[PDB]
Amino acid sequence: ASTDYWQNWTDGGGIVNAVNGSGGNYSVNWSNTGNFVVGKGWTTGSPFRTINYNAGVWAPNGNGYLTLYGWTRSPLIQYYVVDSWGTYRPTGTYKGTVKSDGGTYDIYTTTRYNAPSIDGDRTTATQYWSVRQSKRPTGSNATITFTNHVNAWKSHGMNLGSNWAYQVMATEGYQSSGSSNVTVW
Ligand SMILES: [Zn+2]
Ligand SMILES: [Zn+2]
C-alpha cells in the first residue's frame, strides 16, 4: 500500500539537497546543517502498518538518524523508531526494551522544548523512542513492524494520540554532513 507523503523540512542551516524520487525513493546530500527532516511515507499513519525500507546509502558524518518518524494528535505525541545513526545515539528516560524485526530496541521518553512541530513550526514535543541497541545493517530490505513498538510503548504507559498525522521513514540530521538514499514501501 504505497507511500503518498513527502517530508522535506529544514531550519535553513547549511545545505540540505533533498530529492523526491520516483515511488517511495528519496535521497539527501547535506552539508554543515542545522536541523532537518526528510523522508517518505504516509499522510495518515497507522499503528498496524508494516514499514518496508531499503537504505541503499546511509552515510552520515556527524549526527544523523535513520528512523521512522511520525506524529499523533489528541494528544500531540512524536514518535521515533531509530534503526541507525551517525556520531550520536539518541537516548532519554529509560523505560524498557522491545524486540522487533531481528533487533532489540531501548525504549525512551523525552520532552523537547522548541522542537519542530508536525508542520515544521515549533512546539513542546512529548517524544516516544525505540532506539536500536546497535546500528542496523543497511542495503538489504528491512521491516519495521510498528505494532510491536506501539504495543510495547502502551505496556510501559506510553499511549499515542487518537488522531494520526504522517508516518515516514526519515533521515533526520543536526550539525552534520552526509548522504542517504532510501526507498520506502
Ligand atoms: Zn516491556
Ligand atoms: Zn504550524
Task: Find out whether 55 and 139 touch, Cβ atoms under 8 Å.
Answer: yes
Domain boundaries, the chain: 5-184
Number of residues that make up the chain: 185
Rounded to the nearest angstrom, the distance between the alpha carbon of 123 and the centre of ligand 2 is 9
Q: Which CATH architecture has domain 5-184?
A: Sandwich (2.60)
Closest ligand relative to 107 C-alpha? 1
Task: Find out whether 145 and 152 touch, Cβ atoms under 8 Å.
Answer: no
In angstroms, the CA 28 to CA 56 distance is 12
In the PDB record, what is the listed experimental method?
X-ray
Rounded to the nearest angstrom, the distance between the alpha carbon of 139 and the centre of ligand 2 is 35
Rounded to the nearest angstrom, the distance between the alpha carbon of 122 and the centre of ligand 2 is 7
Resolution in A: 1.7
Rounded to the nearest angstrom, the distance between the alpha carbon of 182 and the centre of ligand 2 is 27
Beta bridge partners of 146: none
Closest alpha carbon to 7 in 18, 17, 53: 18
In angstroms, the CA 118 to CA 22 distance is 24
Distances (CA, A) of 83 to 46, 80, 87, 114, 163: 19, 9, 14, 25, 25
In angstroms, the CA 185 to CA 173 distance is 22
The amino acid sitting at 43 is T
SS (H, E, C) 11-39: CCCCEEEEEECCCCEEEEEEECCCCEEEE
Greatest Cα pair distance, the chain, in angstroms, is 41
Phi, psi (deg, nearest 5) at residue 155: -70, -20
Residue 61, C-alpha cell as written in the block = 558524518
Parallel/antiparallel/unpaired status of strands 93-100 and 5-10: unpaired
Rounded to the nearest angstrom, the distance between the alpha carbon of 82 and the centre of ligand 1 is 17
